[PDB]
Amino acid sequence: MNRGALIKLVESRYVRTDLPEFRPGDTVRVSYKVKEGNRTRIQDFEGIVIRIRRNGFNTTFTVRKVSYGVGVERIFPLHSPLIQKIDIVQRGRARRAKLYFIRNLSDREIRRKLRADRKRIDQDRAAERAAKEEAQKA
Amino acid sequence: RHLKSGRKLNRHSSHRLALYRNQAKSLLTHGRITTTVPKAKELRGFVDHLIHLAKRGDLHARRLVLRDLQDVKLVRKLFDEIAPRYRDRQGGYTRVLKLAERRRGDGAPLALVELVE
Amino acid sequence: MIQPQTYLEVADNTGARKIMCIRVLKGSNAKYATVGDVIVASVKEAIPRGAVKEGDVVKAVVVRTKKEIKRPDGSAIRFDDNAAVIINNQLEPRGTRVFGPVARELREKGFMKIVSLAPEVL
Amino acid sequence: AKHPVPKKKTSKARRDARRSHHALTPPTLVPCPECKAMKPPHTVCPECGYYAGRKVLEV
Amino acid sequence: MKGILGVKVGMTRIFRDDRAVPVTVILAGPCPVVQRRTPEKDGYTAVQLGFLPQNPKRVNRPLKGHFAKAGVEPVRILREIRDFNPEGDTVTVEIFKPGERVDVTGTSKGRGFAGVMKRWNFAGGPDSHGAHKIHRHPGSIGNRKTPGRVYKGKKMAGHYGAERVTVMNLEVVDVIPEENLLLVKGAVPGPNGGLVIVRETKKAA
RNA sequence: GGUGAAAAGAACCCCGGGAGGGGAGUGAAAUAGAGCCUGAAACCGUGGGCUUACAAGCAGUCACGGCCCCGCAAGGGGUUGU
RNA sequence: CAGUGGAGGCCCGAACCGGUGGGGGAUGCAAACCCCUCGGAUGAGCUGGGGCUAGGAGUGAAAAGCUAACCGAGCCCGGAGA
RNA sequence: GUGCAAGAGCACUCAGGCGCGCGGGAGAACCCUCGCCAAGGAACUCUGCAAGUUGGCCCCGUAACUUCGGGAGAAGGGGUGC
RNA sequence: ACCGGAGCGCUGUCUCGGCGAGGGACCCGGUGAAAUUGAACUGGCCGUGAAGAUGCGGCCUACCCGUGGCAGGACGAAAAGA
RNA sequence: GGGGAGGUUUGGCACCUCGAUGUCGGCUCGUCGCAUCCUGGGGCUGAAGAAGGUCCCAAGGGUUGGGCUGUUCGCCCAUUAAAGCGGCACGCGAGCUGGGUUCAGAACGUCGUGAGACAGUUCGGUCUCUAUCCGCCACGGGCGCAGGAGGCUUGAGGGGGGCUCUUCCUAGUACGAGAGGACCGGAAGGGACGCACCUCUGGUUUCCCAGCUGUCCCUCCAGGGGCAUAAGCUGGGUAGCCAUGUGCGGAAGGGAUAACCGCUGAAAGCAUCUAAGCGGGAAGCCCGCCCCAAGAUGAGGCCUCCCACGGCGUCAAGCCGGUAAGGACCCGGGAAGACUACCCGGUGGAUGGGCCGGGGGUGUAAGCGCCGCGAGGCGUUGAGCCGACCGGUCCCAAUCGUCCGAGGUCU
Hints:
This is part of a larger assembly, with chains A, B, C, D and E. By secondary structure, chain C is mainly beta. Chain C has helices spanning 104-109, 112-117, and strands at residues 7-8, 16-24, 38-46, 57-62, 77-79, 84-87. In chain C, strands 1-2-3-4-6 form a five-stranded antiparallel beta sheet, with no helix packed on it. Chain D contains one helix and two strands, in the order αββ. Chain D has one helix at 12-18, and strands at 30-31, 38-39. The structure holds five RNA strands. Chain E: GO terms for molecular function: rRNA binding; structural constituent of ribosome. Chain E: One of the primary rRNA binding proteins, it binds directly near the 3'-end of the 23S rRNA, where it nucleates assembly of the 50S subunit.
């Protein structure tokens, strides 16, 4: 009963072991929702993210995405309401994590400051039909 | 709830740093060293850390050692005499122990660093 | 946090484009409004050919703020500003041309009209 | 010599008491094994010593 | 008005139901019942409650290994639930069920001698205009000549910390017997891994 | 301002860096020991007699009680529970 | 008009005079000082040296300010124990 | 000595000098002086007092008015490193 | 560097304060003043009183002494009241 | 037209104070008062309902934020269930401000032959670090409680806490021509406020990591160090500290009541809510609730634990030296703390540190090959480092051991 952390880690029937790995580079696609007097929806949300704050239990992620009005910032609790949430093209090579300088100048400098690592997509290429080779080897 | 954490003080953060480092230099030169108790404590911790780094032998580490210190011949004797002996030792290579009387003039609890081997 | 002595630009046709915060309809000690809130409003910067000239004093309901508020499931949301919607002494969105993403919080309050014409509700 | 100034003398007995909770304080000593004198507790004596007793070079 | 003894752990937010819940857990565990109490030779109705076993030589003497049943002593020793007569055995955690509301008692951590702002709460004032000499200060206390006394209990510059409080109306959502835990709508007073007694709530009876 | 009749104004051992002291020794006297004759009070020490940790005060007065020390008695002084 | 040239009780700002808005200091480092900021800044400038002018008198870009740290008449000393 | 438009400026530092005639631990309230501040932006206040934003050099650009000198660094904006 | 009024940007002036800083404050040792000071054995209420009391009546709270801290009162200290 | 009460206003008096009692408003901090402004209840109404008016009881809690003016007063503003009045030296300058005020400058309007002066105005202008006693708030030392130690309690008394809005439902039924528009119960959110907590949100970290400037030095290169704050500058930032954040507190209910509404019932065959008896009835009173608290001199209670003659008191209470439960000195410390105390561990031990792992912070390092002449850059790489942190680990520090500790009043 000593390690309080032990106990909290035994509360870990609450875990998400099936979510797209991402850095505070980019992310994108979808999330979850409610919407209307019965709930019934999962309002899709893309996004270019900002912050990964690690809490183990609920390492939350704040996300920037600029829509039909202006810039919008939505933070998600990594583990329940969001069903699949799954992104588009992660991106990275970010030096920090906290993309706050983007609430300064969000424009082409955004595009002018982000390159996804190809190596990631190469890993995706391998794991693509190595997953069928996985559905082939023992 | 201040202090509710740790770390002793009374200097400039810089002045602190430079003091710890110096004490390490003067130490590693000799081995058994007279100081005041609080000093002695945070001292033995800091220096111990440095010596466990010395227990390795990477250049990264080496510079890091002398990044916190000064003399080259000191890194020689460090990684040539000191570090080799305390090889099996996985802990406090320094032992600090209190002395009687107290620091004359204003009465302060004294202590002595030791080589411990 | 929206309090008085704050500039709020509207997100519709209106006849205005910037309105300052006067008071709150909330309890006489609630000097604080946010999402789905009722704020009395002076008009400070408007556009000529229109209805609500500069100096007009009508009411308003916020759709968008620079301080995200936690949605009941621990997932917040912010719009980089202090945008509102103009309403009258009868709770009615005076204009007709709502602009940008609102907050569904408004939907639960009683501004069902906005929710509708609202493009991307969040 | 400013605002707060003792208004009427302080009586001798009062001085006494202020100093009643004052007064000097005893020391406390411990026996030295492998030796024969007194030291402060857990300390080292240059006449006695700790285990092994490092130094002890009194003339 | 039942009860249980407990130690504190956790605080999170378990996204149970559909929304989210700040969740503070506590370990009630094998918390002994080692002496009842009865009116004539007491005056109330009560039970002593122990806790965590690790006690060897440093405890000894009366033990109440006497009492009438030994069971040794915990090490966090024992306290008292009022108006409570148990079934007997060292009670555990499952005393309450997921679906109840309760009260919870524990010490407030030490913030010691504090400034009147961070205490009862005052105001101080003038960062600039006025002066610099009375930033975090009480300013006034009492009237001119009559009183000429300083109001007894006038919210003053003093201690604010190592105290104690009982909280009412919480909501224990979970309880695990397998490891002895009790999970409530996070509101726990006091630090993590400390002393805290749980007892049932009050409302209309 | 003033040792003392007179310098006879302190050898020697002792502890101590000395400073200063402890005998020795000086003289009638060192409680004349060196800006020292004679040492009032305020003044801070130290030992012992009485009294004080439910206690409301211009502090003492008056009486009753008890504690200590006196006195041959009877009486007294000192103290303060009330 | 261009080039030239380098005029200013010129312009920004050191040393250099000052002392403006503030904080600090208040038996202070200090019988006027520290920190921030300020204004003069080749001129009515500032500065080392020797000399002059005085108590109803001087000196004053003028406050009755300065004449030795307290000036509606300096200080001393004498009538004066007014 | 080096660097920035330059320099008796500033930042580091030559050489020379020095650590300021009490300190040692804690790591309270509060105070001196100093940094960050959400979201709102003088709502504070007698008063934007104070603090802060602006900040240097090449480029671009400049009202009403005027005694043609000015107002002008008007303001508004662009670069600067390798 | 003179007194208002306004506007932009900006900002802990404010909403409303939270942490952090080192240095003082607090504990160890060395040194160690001041104004003031009739003597104190100094709670409060409610009346009185030369009209605003721990000292007086009635009647009051509370073992004895201290450390840190605030500042209503002792008609608080310094000014033989401008 | 009469009678009063109140002591805020405005005056009359000149007794304390001229060897000083520092006068305005605002900040801060209040507390009391009730002739209640808001919130309950109730009475009556020229009261259908609605809302209104007026009168009695009731201070528990509340009494907002901006504009002008030094200004309180006032008006305005947008609001609110509400924007109450007053006392306490018209509360509060050994607590602040000094803007207003009646210092010396100057001017202004102005009176005076004039120096100067004017409830006439204007611009500037030095609130004095050290709390002796009281009082208040926190904290200890001594003694206490008529055996000695631990541990768990009891509640004397006292303090805190008491608010309050809109909305849906009954039913658009009752009333009402309609417009309007309901009592009674229920249901859901709000605001201000007290409380505690770092999970989420976000500020925070004085050296946790990164980018960087000129520089000076190791060591010419890379690399690395200090300075620039008391971190040079910026970008981020765990723990712990926090509010805007977050879970909660005001309840329900019981008992006596006001004003008032009622029942049986007389004197005084009838009447009465009373003079006997009894019932309903308020955010008000007592409690429930939270917290203190047996210095509740009356020291309480419970549960255990230890025990005489050892030397003077023969008879009388002491006195003296170590012991038994025990407790402390010193140490290693602590979401404890000014000191103390409170809490924990002291070799049989994980208490600090060191070590290794976990998390988390930062974001591909020192260097190695590799492309451009080059600034650099591909790769080795989510690496290296690592402040508090969840813990494992006796590698080193908590060695040795010292001293205080009942001999048990009586009736």
